[PDB]
């Protein structure tokens, strides 16, 4: 029920990253049970609340679209079970109230992570997040 | 441009806090400290989170333009800013508490976690209000 490897571990994060930093006007209540899968359950009131932020801000008038744009580094937290993950996010904002524009928002993103479901076989889990934005 | 991504990187470490991450959050500050500055950002940052008990998290972002100089006879360069912390219960209600802050740190160059070497020396804060 739990496959450990750098393979596992970037797909797991590519999409728990597309989940919670990107969005569609389409499908919202799917996208929160996914993301919540993904989530430690201490950790799944602060993926509502960024979840809830995007809403607030994309309404149904924008589209985001966001993508791992960098390596993914990874150590180990001294005396703890959690690993770090930092790497870079790409989010492509284009509003559907045009024809022809769009703007990119550029993050830096570390990640906490261990192992604990037709969405997360194996167990994935996010414990914590911490963001610094690039402009 | 890669400054302001470090010193954004130090103000949130020092000033943010989150239960999960809390020991990688202080391995982390200690990497943006000069040995000779470890000690008293450690003692800052353990009065920091005095404020935070059980299901709270704090964030902590640069909130006013930069200000740089150069520190005479010296390799430092003096930065002086506004920092926005928000504090927020790690549960579903809705309160957020907002704390603002005058900061300048003395900044060198001496790796994952800092790798250009952005090292401070030493930091003064002040209230907003």
């Known amino acids: 029920q739990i496959?450990?490897?750098?393979?596992?571990?970037?797909?797991?994060?590519?999409?728990?990253?597309?989940?919670?930093?990107?969005?569609?006007k389409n499908s919202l209540r799917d996208r929160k049970d996914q993301l919540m899968?993904?989530?430690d359950v201490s950790f799944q009131t602060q993926a509502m609340r960024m979840f809830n932020e995007?809403?607030?801000?994309?309404?149904?008038?924008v589209r985001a679209e966001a993508i791992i744009s960098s390596n993914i580094q990874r150590?180990?937290?001294?005396?703890?079970p959690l690993t770090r993950l930092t790497f870079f996010i790409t989010i492509?904002?284009?509003?559907?109230?045009?024809?022809?524009?769009?703007?990119?928002?550029?993050?830096?993103?570390?990640?906490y992570y261990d192992f604990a479901?037709?969405?997360?076989?194996?167990?994935?889990?996010?414990?914590?997040?911490?963001?610094?934005d690039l402009q």
């Open 3 to 24: 496959v450990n490897s750098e393979a596992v571990v970037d797909s797991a994060t590519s999409k728990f990253v597309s989940l919670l930093f990107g969005y569609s």
């Open 37 to 39: 899968q993904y989530c």
């Open 54 to 61: 995007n809403i607030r801000q994309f309404v149904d008038k």
């Open 75 to 80: 150590e180990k937290v001294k005396n703890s």
């Open 92 to 111: 492509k904002i284009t509003p559907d109230t045009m024809e022809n524009y769009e703007y990119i928002t550029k993050k830096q993103v570390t990640i």
């Open 117 to 132: 479901l037709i969405i997360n076989p194996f167990g994935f889990k996010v414990f914590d997040i911490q963001i610094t």
